[PDB]
Ligand binder design. Structure first.
Ligand SMILES: O=c1[nH]cnc2c1ncn2[C@@H]1O[C@H](COP(=O)(O)O)[C@@H](O)[C@H]1O
Ligand SMILES: O=c1[nH]cnc2c1ncn2[C@@H]1O[C@H](COP(=O)(O)O)[C@@H](O)[C@H]1O
Lengths: 173, 178
């Protein structure tokens, strides 16, 4: 896929960051190349439309690198974007979950029965995405799918999310 | 201006957050309403094109709420977006800059290879308050020898005089509150 190649060629891999033995996948060059960013959003949007049709109500973007993709993805789908933040950042009534770190969402971000797709840049252990799904569930929202640009498959994050479906553009061990 | 109204009607105000006496301006509803978000990006892009023509090389988005607007604004302009992050998150060689946030200090960081000398950038964040954050971003970019053409935000809290702090770098906001 020519479009997928535009994204893959702009992932930069750094060995031994942040700790020896691990390879950090840097998505920054995807943002810097407008063709690459457009390809990434287009591919995610096509997948989501082909899988869910008109069932999606909102995209939920994860702080902070999810915020880079969520709004553009939402716009491509004609949808709004709701935000899941690091705790202590949102005003008003909120719910929070720890996984340590803590995520937060405004209680009025979604109404019961609304259907959401969660986006982040990269799925590793799945801890972060799992916490987001739990938060959303507490608003009685339905999480249709979680998606990312990158998935680190040896960390088995996909299994952590099950039975919520997961999709990534690119996979690395 | 109906487009500007679409943005203004989706700013939510929270008194006494995070401390008593202030009013937090929440742009979250702008993101939730796709027409509002589209209006915000369009208004920013129109201003930037009218002010800089074709001279902008890159948008720099500020972690974390600037990330919400940077890529869409960049895309509207046909440009890439570079990232200025909270310190500790970026691989490769970096530069960082501290500034006062609340009662203590915070640090922003950029990859030393984010920009080449002479490249021209516009910085975007959701809201300008004291101007500490945006000032730090401009310092980092200046240390890469980039030229900051302008800083922009959706909201500006004018009593805090962030515009003066940024001078002589130009600043533009869609909406102003005391
Ligand atoms: O290799 C990496 N590259 C970039 N971000 C990463 C990497 N590993 C973890 N992350 C960040 O940490 C998060 C996922 O961690 P998880 O909770 O272990 O799945 C995502 O939000 C990423 O932004
Ligand atoms: O009232 C507010 N609403 C939303 N964000 C704010 C507000 N005040 C400060 N901030 C955040 O802190 C920043 C700038 O504060 P400054 O450094 O004093 O200009 C931006 O990154 C904002 O996202």
């Amino acid at each position: 896929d020519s479009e997928l190649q535009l994204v893959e060629q702009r992932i930069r891999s750094f060995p031994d960051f942040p700790t020896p033995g691990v390879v950090f996948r840097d998505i920054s060059p995807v943002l810097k190349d407008p063709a690459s960013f457009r390809a990434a959003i287009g591919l995610l949007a096509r997948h989501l439309k082909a899988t869910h049709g008109g069932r999606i109500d909102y995209i939920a973007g994860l702080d902070s690198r999810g915020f880079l993709f969520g709004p553009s993805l939402a716009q491509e789908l004609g949808l709004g974007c709701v935000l899941i933040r690091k705790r202590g950042k949102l005003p008003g009534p909120t719910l929070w979950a720890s996984y340590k770190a803590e995520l937060e969402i405004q209680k009025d971000a979604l109404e019961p029965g609304q259907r959401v797709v969660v986006v982040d840049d990269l799925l590793a252990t799945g801890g972060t995405m799992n916490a987001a799904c739990e938060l959303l569930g507490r608003l009685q929202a339905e999480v249709l799918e979680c998606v990312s640009l990158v998935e680190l498959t040896s960390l088995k994050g996909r299994e952590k999310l099950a039975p919520v479906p997961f999709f990534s553009l690119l996979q690395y061990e």
